[PDB]
Amino acid sequence: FVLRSHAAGLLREGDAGQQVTLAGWVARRRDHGGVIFIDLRDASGIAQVVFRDPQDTEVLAQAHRLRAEFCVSVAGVVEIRPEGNANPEIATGEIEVNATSLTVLGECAPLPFQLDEPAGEELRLKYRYLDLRRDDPAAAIRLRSRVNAAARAVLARHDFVEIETPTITRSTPEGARDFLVPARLHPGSFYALPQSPQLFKQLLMVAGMERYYQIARCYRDEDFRADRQPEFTQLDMEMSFVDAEDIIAISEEVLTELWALIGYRIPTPIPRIGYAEAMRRFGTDKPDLRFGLELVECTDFFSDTTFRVFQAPYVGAVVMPGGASQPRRTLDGWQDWAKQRGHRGLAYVLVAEDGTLGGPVAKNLTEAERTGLADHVGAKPGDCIFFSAGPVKSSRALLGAARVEIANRLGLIDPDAWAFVWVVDPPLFEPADEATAAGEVAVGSGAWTAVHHAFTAPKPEWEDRIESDTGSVLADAYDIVCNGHEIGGGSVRIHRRDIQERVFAVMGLDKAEAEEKFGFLLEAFMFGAPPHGGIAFGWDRTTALLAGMDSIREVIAFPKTGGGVDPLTDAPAPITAQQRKES
Numbered sequence: 001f002v003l004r005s006h007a008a009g010l011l012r013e014g015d016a017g018q019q020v021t022l023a024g025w026v027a028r029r030r031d032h033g034g035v036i037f038i039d040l041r042d043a044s045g046i047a048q049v050v051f052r053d054p055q056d057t058e059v060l061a062q063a064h065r066l067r068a069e070f071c072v073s074v075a076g077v078v079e080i081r082p083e084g085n086a087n088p089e090i091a092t093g094e095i096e097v098n099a100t101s102l103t104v105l106g107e108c109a110p111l112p113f114q115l116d117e118p119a120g121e122e123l124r125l126k127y128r129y130l131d132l133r134r135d136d137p138a139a140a141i142r143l144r145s146r147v148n149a150a151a152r153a154v155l156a157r158h159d160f161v162e163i164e165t166p167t168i169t170r171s172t173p174e175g176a177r178d179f180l181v182p183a184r185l186h187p188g189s190f191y192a193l194p195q196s197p198q199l200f201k202q203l204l205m206v207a208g209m210e211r212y213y214q215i216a217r218c219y220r221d222e223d224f225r226a227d228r229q230p231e232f233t234q235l236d237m238e239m240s241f242v243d244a245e246d247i248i249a250i251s252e253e254v255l256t257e258l259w260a261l262i263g264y265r266i267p268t269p270i271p272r273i274g275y276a277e278a279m280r281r282f283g284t285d286k287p288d289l290r291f292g293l294e295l296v297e298c299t300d301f302f303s304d305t306t307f308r309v310f311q312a313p314y315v316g317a318v319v320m321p322g323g324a325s326q327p328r329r330t331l332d333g334w335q336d337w338a339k340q341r342g343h344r345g346l347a348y349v350l351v352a353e354d355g356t357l358g359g360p361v362a363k364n365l366t367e368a369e370r371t372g373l374a375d376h377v378g379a380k381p382g383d384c385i386f387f388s389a390g391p392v393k394s395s396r397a398l399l400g401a402a403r404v405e406i407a408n409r410l411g412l413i414d415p416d417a418w419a420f421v422w423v424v425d426p427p428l429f430e431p432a433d434e435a436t437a438a439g440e441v442a443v444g445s446g447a448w449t450a451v452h453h454a455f456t457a458p459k460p461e462w463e464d465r466i467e468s469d470t471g472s473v474l475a476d477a478y479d480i481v482c483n484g485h486e487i488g489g490g491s492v493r494i495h496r497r498d499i500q501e502r503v504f505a506v507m508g509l510d511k512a513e514a515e516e517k518f519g520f521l522l523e524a525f526m527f528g529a530p531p532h533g534g535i536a537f538g539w540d541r542t543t544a545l546l547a548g549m550d551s552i553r554e555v556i557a558f559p560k561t562g563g564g565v566d567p568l569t570d571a572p573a574p575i576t577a578q579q580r581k582e583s
């Protein structure tokens with residue numbers, strides 16, 4: 001019949017005396033004196049349905065079968081619950097359905113886990129369709145739909161064009177390994193899943209599309225970490241006849257509509273800091289600006305200290321307020337914490353209430369060091385100053401990571417705060433030995449590789465110095481950071497055949513090694529390529545921030561575990577011999 005005519009969660013006291021038929025799942029069942037009470041849940045909410053005197057004896061034969069998560073279709077009459085049965089916590093607090101008919105649409109076996117007691121990672125993914133029935137995962141998936149519509153609304157206001165790009169095509173370098181697809185009608189040759197639609201969106205700018213956008217699917221065989229899985233989603237954008245200012249301006253407008261979905265007006269324009277300044281003050285190119293605790297350089301301070309472990313190219317410091325009152329277990333635990341990061345340890349010097357500098361670092365001072373150490377790093381009586389020495393990037397990152405953990409233990413991060421920042425003027429190159437050490441795939445066999453991608457253009461001031469001082473080259477790129485998370489990054493592109501070949505030659509791509517890999521793109525630059533640039537947002541992390549979830553898998557409908565394991569579909573699985581033949 002009519003499986004559903006009303007919504008369960010929308011009923012009210014003014015809808016009483018109405019013959020309705022509902023459809024949904026049984027949230028709970030409780031028998032009280034022979035009367036069966038059920039909580040009927042659909043996508044709109046929960047309403048209570050009761051069974052009274054046997055209007056039909058066949059109904060009670062089925063009503064006694066009802067259990068948790070039974071999918072049913074109930075027809076009754078909305079009435080007012082008797083005095084003493086009102087639920088001020090539920091929306092439908094004073095209403096119940098006196099059922100007359102009842103149909104079991106889908107019997108439910110005893111659940112692997114109840115919807116109120118959450119389970120582990122493997123169990124929630126193996127039964128994700130049951131996990132998605134919970135309140136928080138459902139609202140997270142439905143929010144991601146409004147996030148897409150919010151981004152499409154901004155770009156549609158600016159005459160952008162939604163264009164789908166091939167996913168079975170050529171390799172695109174982004175710093176990771178490619179996912180391969182065997183060509184059936186071409187034995188030995190392999191397609192490649194796109195690490196990004198970077199190449200196709202630059203060709204679309206040569207095509208005169210001017211303004212392009214796409215919510216694309218990107219595939220990167222990375223080490224399972226951070227804000228994306230092997231298969232993740234981006235908000236891809238690209239414009240022509242624009243500079244970095246134009247792309248930042250439209251990116252801030254997209255973020256404004258996104259965070260407006262949760263009721264937070266972003267202060268436009270978002271502040272910007274340079275790459276060299278960002279790592280100088282915070283130790284990372286993606287800093288958290290919800291708290292202070294900035295790094296204090298002490299290299300000049302220890303130019304006369306006889307401590308050999310501080311006779312290094314860099315000396316950093318982070319002051320923990322009130323950190324001298326920590327027990328020995330908390331201080332010794334910081335050494336085991338710093339040991340897992342990749343350093344010899346996090347040396348510190350406590351400050352007594354009387355101002356005396358104490359700790360293992362205090363005995364190494366040079367009197368004049370003990371005089372100014374508390375005043376140089378901005379330490380108060382009772383503070384704790386964690387020091388980091390050694391190479392610049394190693395000590396900056398070790399202190400930049402130690403800076404964040406101090407905010408966690410001291411309860412310094414306000415969870416309701418939002419700290420956006422642009423990180424501009426990054427380096428365009430970095431040593432290939434430092435990238436492959438972090439598990440990244442190098443562009444070429446040379447001593448350099450791209451910091452974003454090889455198609456990033458240098459600033460016009462450093463265009464003449466791609467070959468000379470390679471490391472000093474500043475990039476025309478920009479990354480947007482939110483609460484210590486990188487949620488997006490872009491750059492102005494190279495649109496000349498000769499400059500793209502110079503950048504390729506620096507990274508170790510031979511003059512023929514580019515024609516074989518990117519000969520189509522270099523060819524397109526000979527046919528009136530416009531100045532263009534763009535940006536791509538990590539859509540999984542952006543949605544997880546808007547939803548308040550720290551794990552990005554909470555905003556993916558059917559995510560995988562760490563390592564590509566799929567508990568739901570048991571993928572990947574081997575193939576037959578007949579299937580393997582076409583390879």
Ligand SMILES: N[C@@H](CCC(=O)O)C(=O)O
Nearest residue numbers: 009042043044045135139
């Ligand atoms: N808010 C969800 C479920 C109700 C709830 O959060 O308790 C909805 O719109 O149906």
Ligand SMILES: N[C@@H](CCCC[NH3+])C(=O)O
Nearest residue numbers: 003004005006007008044
């Ligand atoms: N006709 C709807 C039910 C009534 C409207 C519920 N929102 C359906 O079959 O899904």
Ligand SMILES: N[C@@H](CCCC[NH3+])C(=O)O
Nearest residue numbers: 158159160161209210211
């Ligand atoms: N986006 C284009 C116009 C798109 C609509 C053209 N009929 C521009 O800014 O020039």
Ligand SMILES: N[C@@H](CC(=O)O)C(=O)O
Nearest residue numbers: 196198489490534535536
């Ligand atoms: N293609 C870049 C984004 C961009 O440069 O526009 C990425 O995937 O991170």
